[PDB]
Structures are given as structure tokens and as C-alpha cells.
Amino acid sequence: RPLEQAVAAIVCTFQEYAGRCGDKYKLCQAELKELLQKELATWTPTEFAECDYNKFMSVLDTNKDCEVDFVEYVRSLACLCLYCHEYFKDCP
């Protein structure tokens, strides 16, 4: 089922980055930034999302806390949808 494959893949990608070194359940925000920039390279903000997207991406670049857990990683994917996927163009 498509969603099963997709959610397996989202764990796979987390494993790839979090498993590099140290705590296998945590990313640094620098690693999360790298992940999003490499693994979603083609995703760009929709016409009204630009400023929220820019604020989002700057926070990752500035913040260097390393307590990004799986749930926070998946939240970041969700936010990138709200910014970059046309379905949410007109969402509050």
C-alpha cells in the first residue's frame, strides 16, 4: 500500500542521517537542514508561502540544538508540505 511504502521510506531516510554517529534517535538541526536540502531538493515554496518557508529554513541554519527527534523530523516534512505543495496553497 502506497502509504506503507511512504512511511517506511521516511523512517529509512531518518535512519540514514541519524545513524551516522552518536545517538541513533536524534539529529542535529544542521543534519536536518542537510537532509531537507538534499532529499527534497526540488521542493520550493508556493506563491504565498515564501516568507514562512524562508523563516523556517533560517531557523534551522541558525539553531544548533541537537535534540531533533523523529517526531520533530516528521513535523518538518509536514511544514515543507504546507509551504511547497500546491494542495495547501490556500490553507490558512
Next chain:
Amino acid sequence: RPLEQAVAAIVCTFQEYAGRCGDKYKLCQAELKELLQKELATWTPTEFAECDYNKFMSVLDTNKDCEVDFVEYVRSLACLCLYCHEYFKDC
């Protein structure tokens, strides 16, 4: 790229359920329950997760608030990983 395909698919599934009727940006918890039970049918809790998984699923069955937005839907997927995916067995 595998992640791009995956995250597109997660939006697709949301659209399928949220687009049925009413507000296309919202689910009811009943719809979220149906989604998880149908679309992740084969996923079951790891050895230590059973009680957290059961609490999670019961909350969906009892609660009939309809303010489940995309971010909450994706959070629910993440929680199901923590419960059901072996990577997180010892998390």
C-alpha cells in the same frame, strides 16, 4: 528521490480522505482512524509499545473532534512509527 516520492504520497493520502466532503484541510478523528486502519493495515506494535499503541488508537475511537489538520495527521504517522517500526523498539 525516495523521500520526495514518499512525502508526495503522504499528501495524496490526506487529500483522498480530507477531500471526501466539507473542509479539504481537515479530518475528523473518525476519518483519521479509518485512514490509519486501512492504509497502514499491516503495521502492528513492537514488543514494548503495545500499551502506548492501544492508548493511541483508543483516543482516536473515543474522540470525535474534527480539527485534525495535516500536521496532526503526519504526527499520527510518526507516532505509529514509534510504536510499530523496529528501528524505534528501544527508543
